[PDB]
């Protein structure tokens, strides 16, 4: 019945106004896979930050995924070098203490010529640190605010003629060049241009930077190999089956668990005070602080909870038809958010922390904002209710999975669905999109993960190692593609995303004994057992506690979390 | 038909009203719609069960599929010492041409309900952390499983495929 | 340790504290699981120790 | 009872193998009340004008206010299109979380 669907598609295009060549080319564009973007997480050499321009996102001014290929102000470009030399009381400290002054002076003198108010920010931001080292010269540089003010100060006008000399060693010059080459587009190239055009280094410089870039290009890692992560498991003990899904913050200092009796429980994962004294020390050591704070603002059971990337606010979604906001440094409620008439099941912040999306029983997802009490977009189009919600890592699309065996990608501005992904056989329960952004992964309640690509919309492959049960959470490797799935069968499994695709991801050159005999025992029967894909590599069981949360930290250490069940 | 009742359950409510004789087409269509409504309760119940992070279908998982589906609440299915499956299906047969089960219950005094001591309360929740894996293998502390008794405990549809690095 | 370290240093050019693979790291805080039980028991004995006041 | 084990087979037919004991009791005490109300309203509607269209009137009288509504996707699509007319507001550009105004937050309140 798929050839008849192809004929219905062709007649739909013919009646909806696509030329025969145009429909053939749109079919050929729909069939081929999304190619590889080499700047996939935007590596810090050729990648830029997002603009902070106070406008909402817009997925327009944008070409297709099928086609092949793919200002930066002075204060942050100096603060990068400032913090990099400030993080070191090493053997190379006072040479950076020497060379930190004329780069600041030349950046200030090159920034007064373009933007005066940014220059007034930049001067007084980094003023009082070397005043005792460089005398009243910075007091002489108070009266420079324009191009004609530079002609008043004779040393500032001489700084264009007198190139500032500095005698630098070879190891310090190579350290500075290999630091300012490893991140160009933050401002390293802007520092390098000032160093090349205004400084006098004692030991041509363009050939030196060419040799730096060529020797840095001569040794890289082209195709990455897999790595098995270390999992730290947080097991919660005295929860009599009344602890819903939990979450960890970033820096992993706070854990938030939503209870069935309308509390949010807040744990300091370091054993810290979690009282935020802030030197006031007024009174009340008479209370009992077990390094754990409770939050009582809900009247229903808390079904989801999400932490801001700022990590100072908590967002709790309940079955009373509100989502509440909590301050993590005074432990009270701030804002109630009322836009649903059914229970709330999955709240999730943006990547940049701008605005949060919500899932509920009313078959619609809702886009919000943390400063608006009522919603901003309604995501309608599912047949059953929405279970999970997640953004694209740029904060520009929304992904919602629902209990009618499908998930959708929504435009965040126009509201209408852009992708519909079909192929599952159970309620989609957890969804996650890779830091590359070209591949979407989700897990159902059938114990089957699968990955599609967002350009073609069809299935690359699936993952068949979990038990016929729920896949509660999902997490991604920070750099590259290794999927960590914490489900309901008490295991945390590890998945290679790049086995059966056109990207093989650098297999080893040269055997085992345990491989292909563990599921060749099959004592329970062939039809009554699971057979794993070739993508599953490892599986860590937890001994009778289930894993509600997997959270892959920055440094190849994942954290799992759950409650000790009996 | 469908699997709820031809007449053997719906008709004994039809007689509870007073309605003597009605056709079997009425009872067929009526019982089909009644167990469709039962499945409509059951599906929201398994949705609340899944989002409450559990595996059993407790009585508060169907009692929250009632408030969602606006059904008037079924009071009296939660008592003291709320344990998992507090066994109370002691329904007593009564004979005849067919079967009748009437759910016997023992009466009790009030002064043995006010002069009855209070149960045990557990500790407030805490956590405890360890290493599930250090490089992709499991370090076999007391907190780790044994990976060979995982065979003799759970079938491979509730424990999944065992593979190791 | 004079016999095992000679074999280890002859193996690398191709109790103990420099077997690299078999080491577990340390956690900044792990929770109580057994000490709180005996803490509650001798706290109950302390509530018996306070001359019979409930 | 016959319907306790019939509810066992019904629950197992939709892959529900773990549940408590009073859950088929709750399903039976729902179905009793629902069928009794439906047959009482149908006896009223048959005294007015039993039969199957009478049952259809009595279960269409109460479909309208309690259970899950039917095909609600086009009304929700219309409602979404009424909400997604307004373009998105201007956001902060200081990379954090901005609150509402102080009267629209749960802080300037008193007991």
UniProtKB/Swiss-Prot annotation, chain A:
GO cellular component entries: nucleus; SAGA complex; SLIK (SAGA-like) complex; transcription factor TFIID complex
Function: Functions as a component of both the DNA-binding general transcription initiation factor complex TFIID and the transcription coactivator SAGA complex. Binding of TFIID to a promoter (with or without TATA element) is the initial step in pre-initiation complex (PIC) formation.
InterPro entries, per database record: G-protein_beta_WD-40_rep (IPR020472), LisH (IPR006594), TFIID_NTD2 (IPR007582), TFIID_NTD2_sf (IPR037264), WD40/YVTN_repeat-like_dom_sf (IPR015943), WD40_repeat_CS (IPR019775), WD40_repeat_dom_sf (IPR036322), WD40_rpt (IPR001680)
Gene Ontology BP terms: chromatin organization; positive regulation of transcription by RNA polymerase II; regulation of transcription by RNA polymerase II; transcription by RNA polymerase II; transcription initiation at RNA polymerase II promoter
Note: Present with 14834 (+/-203) molecules/cell in log phase SD medium.
Name used for this protein in its record: SAGA complex/transcription factor TFIID complex subunit TAF5
Assembly and binders: Component of the 1.8 MDa SAGA (Spt-Ada-Gcn5 acetyltransferase) complex, which is composed of 19 subunits TRA1, SPT7, TAF5, NGG1/ADA3, SGF73, SPT20/ADA5, SPT8, TAF12, TAF6, HFI1/ADA1, UBP8, GCN5, ADA2, SPT3, SGF29, TAF10, TAF9, SGF11 and SUS1.
Gene that encodes the chain: TAF5
Compartments, as annotated in UniProt: Nucleus
Lineage of the organism: Eukaryota, Fungi, Dikarya, Ascomycota, Saccharomycotina
From Swiss-Prot, chain B:
Organism superkingdom: Eukaryota
Keywords, ordered alphabetically: Cytoplasm, Nucleus, Transcription, Transcription regulation
Signal peptide: none
Species name: Saccharomyces cerevisiae (strain ATCC 204508 / S288c) (Baker's yeast)
Principal place of residence: nucleus
Subunit structure, as described in the record: Component of the 1.8 MDa SAGA (Spt-Ada-Gcn5 acetyltransferase) complex, which is composed of 19 subunits TRA1, SPT7, TAF5, NGG1/ADA3, SGF73, SPT20/ADA5, SPT8, TAF12, TAF6, HFI1/ADA1, UBP8, GCN5, ADA2, SPT3, SGF29, TAF10, TAF9, SGF11 and SUS1.
Keyword Nucleus annotated: yes
Function: Functions as a component of both the DNA-binding general transcription initiation factor complex TFIID and the transcription coactivator SAGA complex. Binding of TFIID to a promoter (with or without TATA element) is the initial step in pre-initiation complex (PIC) formation.
Lineage: Eukaryota, Fungi, Dikarya, Ascomycota, Saccharomycotina
Further remark: Present with 6506 (+/-1290) molecules/cell in log phase SD medium.
Location of this fragment in the whole protein: 8 to 172 of 516
Protein name (record): SAGA complex/transcription factor TFIID complex subunit TAF6
Curated annotation (Swiss-Prot), chain C:
PTM notes: Protease PEP4 directly cleaves the C-terminus of SPT7(SAGA) to form SPT7(SLIK) within the SAGA complex in the nucleus.
Compartments, record wording: Nucleus
Highest taxon listed in the record's lineage: Eukaryota
Subunit-level organization: Component of the 1.8 MDa SAGA (Spt-Ada-Gcn5 acetyltransferase) complex, which is composed of 19 subunits TRA1, SPT7, TAF5, NGG1/ADA3, SGF73, SPT20/ADA5, SPT8, TAF12, TAF6, HFI1/ADA1, UBP8, GCN5, ADA2, SPT3, SGF29, TAF10, TAF9, SGF11 and SUS1.
Note, other: Present with 2360 molecules/cell in log phase SD medium.
Purpose: Component of the transcription coactivator SAGA complex. SAGA acts as a general cofactor required for essentially all RNA polymerase II transcription. At the promoters, SAGA is required for transcription pre-initiation complex (PIC) recruitment. It influences RNA polymerase II transcriptional activity through different activities such as TBP interaction (via core/TAF module) and promoter selectivity, interaction with transcription activators (via Tra1/SPT module), and chromatin modification through histone acetylation (via HAT module) and deubiquitination (via DUB module).
Protein name: SAGA complex subunit SPT7
Gene behind this protein: SPT7
Residues of the full protein shown: 741 to 888 of 1332
From Swiss-Prot, chain D:
Disulfide bonds: none
Parent-protein start and end of this portion: 30 to 149 of 157
Major localization listed first in the record, in broad terms: nucleus
Family of the protein in this entry: Belongs to the TAF9 family.
Domain Histone-fold: 1-59
Transcription listed as a keyword: yes
Species name: Saccharomyces cerevisiae (strain ATCC 204508 / S288c)
GO cellular component annotations of the record: nucleus; SAGA complex; SLIK (SAGA-like) complex; transcription factor TFIID complex
Its job: Functions as a component of both the DNA-binding general transcription initiation factor complex TFIID and the transcription coactivator SAGA complex. Binding of TFIID to a promoter (with or without TATA element) is the initial step in pre-initiation complex (PIC) formation.
GO MF, any single term: identical protein binding
Protein name: SAGA complex/transcription factor TFIID complex subunit TAF9
Localisation per UniProt entry: Nucleus
Keywords of this entry: Nucleus, Transcription, Transcription regulation
Keyword set includes Transcription regulation: yes
Taxonomy, superkingdom: Eukaryota
Subunit-structure text: Component of the 1.8 MDa SAGA (Spt-Ada-Gcn5 acetyltransferase) complex, which is composed of 19 subunits TRA1, SPT7, TAF5, NGG1/ADA3, SGF73, SPT20/ADA5, SPT8, TAF12, TAF6, HFI1/ADA1, UBP8, GCN5, ADA2, SPT3, SGF29, TAF10, TAF9, SGF11 and SUS1.
